[PDB]
Structure formats: C-alpha cells, structure tokens
Amino acid sequence: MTVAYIAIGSNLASPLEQVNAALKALGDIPESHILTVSSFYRTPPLGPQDQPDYLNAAVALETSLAPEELLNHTQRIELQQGRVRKAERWGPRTLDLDIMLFGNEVINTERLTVPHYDMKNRGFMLWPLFEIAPELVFPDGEMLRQILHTRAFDKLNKW
Ligand SMILES: Nc1ncnc2c1ncn2[C@@H]1O[C@H](COP(=O)(O)CP(=O)(O)OP(=O)(O)O)[C@@H](O)[C@H]1O
Ligand SMILES: Cc1cccc(C(=O)CSc2nc3c(=O)[nH]c(N)nc3[nH]2)c1
Ligand SMILES: [Ca+2]
Ligand SMILES: [Ca+2]
Ligand SMILES: [Ca+2]
16 A cells, blocks of 8 residues: 545635535545544635635545556546636636655656656645645655755745
C-alpha cells in the first residue's frame, strides 16, 4: 500500500454538497481506503478572480492501485459530478481532484505528473495537507513544516 494525498476543490453548484459527495465516492474507489480528511476551507481564487470562492480540502487515501489507475477514478468522479470543460484557463468547476503526492513517488507520464507541479506554491493545498500530515516529507527531501515556516502564505479560513 501507498498513501496518496488528494487536493479537493469546488466553487460551483453547492461546494459543500460537491465535496461531501466526492468524499463518499473516494471511499468507493477499489483497493483504497480514506485515512484522513482535513477541515474544509473557504479560499479566495488564485489565477482568475472573477469566480466564487473555493471550498478546499485534502484527503489521505491509502491505496494499492497504480498511480494512473487512481487518476482514472478521480477523473471519473469529477465527470460524474458534472465537471464540464470550458475554454477559460483555470475557470470555475463543480469538482477538482488533484493528486498531490503518491507516496514518495515521482511520476511523469502523459496523463499524470506527481508531485503536483505547483503545490509548493499554493497555500490552499499546503495548509490542509499540513493539517492531516504535519510530518510530511516530499520526494526531494523538503519538509512540509519547513516550507510553511519559511514561506509567506496567507492563513486559511475554515468554511
Ligand atoms: N497530479 C495530477 N492530478 C490530477 N490530474 C493531473 C495530474 N497531473 C496531470 N494531470 C492531468 O491534468 C489534466 C488537466 O486537468 P485540469 O483539472 O484541467 C488542470 P487544473 O487542475 O484546472 O489546474 P492545475 O493543474 O494548475 O491545478 C488532466 O486531464 C490530467 O490528465
Ligand atoms: C500560484 C498560482 C498562480 C496562478 C494560478 C494558480 C491556480 O491555482 C489556478 S486554478 C485554482 N484552483 C484553486 C483552488 O482549488 N482554490 C483556490 N482558492 N484557487 C484556485 N485556483 C496558482
Ligand atoms: Ca475503497
Ligand atoms: Ca487544480
Ligand atoms: Ca485538476
């Protein structure tokens, strides 16, 4: 088994309902078990700002799935929760499930890049992650606690 860490975001169609439904669906992923769910946070949008605030959270998911098999399931859940692709980059969505980390693995395939390429620059990913895994060390040896101690991130407010 490996512990994967998944970032959850939603800013459309009742984010609380979307995130709760996503947590139920994550539990139903085969060869996998949810270990920990963070608090829910209400966060101002990064990137384009002409959209509603996000509900952000993080989940620790123990799994024996291959990394791309996990991706298959997370994409399926997003699509089943009505995620529609629009042309605007970083536009609003009913559900976003980003695989932040897959154990200590470094993955670079056509469909999957892990660690998430920008997570070390996003408070809305790092703070919920720290809540559920304060001892976390990245594949490159960097400590999550040290990033959050050193770098300026705004405090997150709970939903
Ligand atoms: N770690 C990861 N988690 C989820 N999807 C990933 C991923 N690495 C690559 N992908 C790929 O990313 C593709 C596009 O996903 P999108 O959700 O449209 C990007 P986004 O989440 O809006 O922006 P971001 O990646 O800057 O957070 C997916 O179809 C998937 O194949
Ligand atoms: C550091 C940086 C620069 C430019 C863009 C971004 C995004 O996160 C774009 S997509 C996105 N996803 C979320 C999200 O899940 N929550 C919040 N608050 N904002 C988000 N924005 C991050
Ligand atoms: Ca399961
Ligand atoms: Ca994302
Ligand atoms: Ca995504």
